[PDB]
Amino acid sequence: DQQTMVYIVSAKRKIIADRMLQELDLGVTMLQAVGAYKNNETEVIMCVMRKATLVKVRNLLKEVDPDAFMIVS
Amino acid sequence: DQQTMVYIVSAKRKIIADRMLQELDLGVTMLQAVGAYKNNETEVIMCVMRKATLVKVRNLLKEVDPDAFMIVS
């Protein structure tokens, strides 16, 4: 429906980020998250997308990281 | 110090959420993430706050869960 901003957390984010671009034509930006410490980098995938692209992405997650999850802003 | 929305990812989130309320009087919502599967729940702390507060919270993270991190919308 209306476009929502999504953060995806995952150990396998580089791989899910590539497949999102390859197979879904999605433009994502790799955000750097504020850890408890500045040394402790953890990056999050950010992607703005229609409420219906989300399902396609969810199913992509199932295939790559069952432990990944998304924050829907 | 513009009020900004924050997500805190941590395994020890219940402890973090309580100390945020007790010692910083911060009001937080325990948001639920969209995982790859829905049986696989993961909870996120949501909190709107000024940047000064973010520094106090960050220091609280160090104190509880070093692996925790924050997404600043």
TrEMBL record, chains A, B:
It is found in: Cell membrane. Residues 27-73 form the DUF2179 domain. It comes from the Bacteria. This is DUF2179 domain-containing protein. The chain holds residues 182 to 254 of 272 of the full protein.
